[PDB]
Design a protein around this motif. Structure first.
Motif, PDB file in Angstrom:
ATOM      1  N   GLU A 173      25.546  21.720  77.796  1.00 16.45           N
ATOM      2  CA  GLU A 173      24.716  20.744  78.499  1.00 16.45           C
ATOM      3  C   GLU A 173      24.489  21.234  79.922  1.00 16.45           C
ATOM      4  O   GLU A 173      25.385  21.107  80.775  1.00 16.45           O
TER       5      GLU A 173
ATOM      6  N   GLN B 210      23.586  21.214  83.666  1.00 16.73           N
ATOM      7  CA  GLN B 210      23.504  20.207  84.713  1.00 16.73           C
ATOM      8  C   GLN B 210      23.258  20.889  86.052  1.00 16.73           C
ATOM      9  O   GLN B 210      23.350  22.113  86.180  1.00 16.73           O
TER      10      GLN B 210
ATOM     11  N   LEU C   8      23.149  16.960  99.772  1.00 27.29           N
ATOM     12  CA  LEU C   8      23.289  16.371 101.099  1.00 27.29           C
ATOM     13  C   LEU C   8      22.314  16.985 102.098  1.00 27.29           C
ATOM     14  O   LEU C   8      21.813  16.283 102.984  1.00 27.29           O
TER      15      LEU C   8
ATOM     16  N   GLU D 218      19.017  15.453 102.183  1.00 21.77           N
ATOM     17  CA  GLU D 218      19.148  14.065 102.613  1.00 21.77           C
ATOM     18  C   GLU D 218      19.272  13.941 104.126  1.00 21.77           C
ATOM     19  O   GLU D 218      18.929  12.894 104.686  1.00 21.77           O
TER      20      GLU D 218
ATOM     21  N   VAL E  24      23.684  12.817  87.930  1.00 17.16           N
ATOM     22  CA  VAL E  24      22.312  12.773  87.438  1.00 17.16           C
ATOM     23  C   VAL E  24      22.207  13.689  86.227  1.00 17.16           C
ATOM     24  O   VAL E  24      22.460  14.896  86.328  1.00 17.16           O
ATOM     25  N   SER E  25      21.831  13.119  85.084  1.00 14.46           N
ATOM     26  CA  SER E  25      21.680  13.887  83.855  1.00 14.46           C
ATOM     27  C   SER E  25      20.697  13.167  82.946  1.00 14.46           C
ATOM     28  O   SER E  25      20.893  11.990  82.629  1.00 14.46           O
TER      29      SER E  25
ATOM     30  N   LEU F 270      25.127   6.428 102.344  1.00 14.31           N
ATOM     31  CA  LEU F 270      24.610   7.459 103.239  1.00 14.31           C
ATOM     32  C   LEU F 270      23.434   6.945 104.061  1.00 14.31           C
ATOM     33  O   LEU F 270      23.253   7.347 105.217  1.00 14.31           O
TER      34      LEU F 270
ATOM     35  N   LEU G 112      22.874   7.659 107.819  1.00 19.54           N
ATOM     36  CA  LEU G 112      21.851   8.607 108.245  1.00 19.54           C
ATOM     37  C   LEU G 112      20.862   7.984 109.221  1.00 19.54           C
ATOM     38  O   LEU G 112      20.244   8.705 110.013  1.00 19.54           O
TER      39      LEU G 112
END
Lengths: 80, 31
Positions: free
Chosen positions: A44, A46, A74, A77, B6-7, B25, B29
């Motif tokens: 799988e 990812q 990060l 972001e 996330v998948s 965050l 931020l």
């Protein structure tokens, strides 16, 4: 009982900023183009993030280590 | 975000729901 198998290229650890990264449950695999992280029983792919791996050791002691680019979520972001 | 990853997407799993995921965050931020 798994039946259909497939061959891939693996690596013990990677190097991002000079230090090694080890996953808690999984290993880094590659099909020849890019590197992905999957478990031991099912393939799988990812996204390689910093939540599954930690910082321990360096990249000058492990024999046979490779380099990779850890996609850290990060960093996009902080610029948003 | 440190508990879930996330998948895949939300069009394969039968019986899925919607929920607002809190992100710590975004207050950090902005400040």
């Amino acid at each position: 009982v798994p039946a259909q198998e497939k061959n891939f290229t693996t690596a013990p650890a990677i190097c991002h900023d000079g230090k090694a990264h080890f996953p808690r449950e999984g290993v880094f695999v590659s099909n020849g183009t890019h590197w992905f992280v999957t478990q031991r029983n099912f393939y799988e792919p990812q996204i390689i993030t910093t939540d599954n791996t930690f910082v321990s050791g360096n990249c000058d002691v492990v024999i046979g280590i490779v380099n990779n680019t850890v996609y850290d979520p990060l960093q996009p972001e902080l610029d948003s």
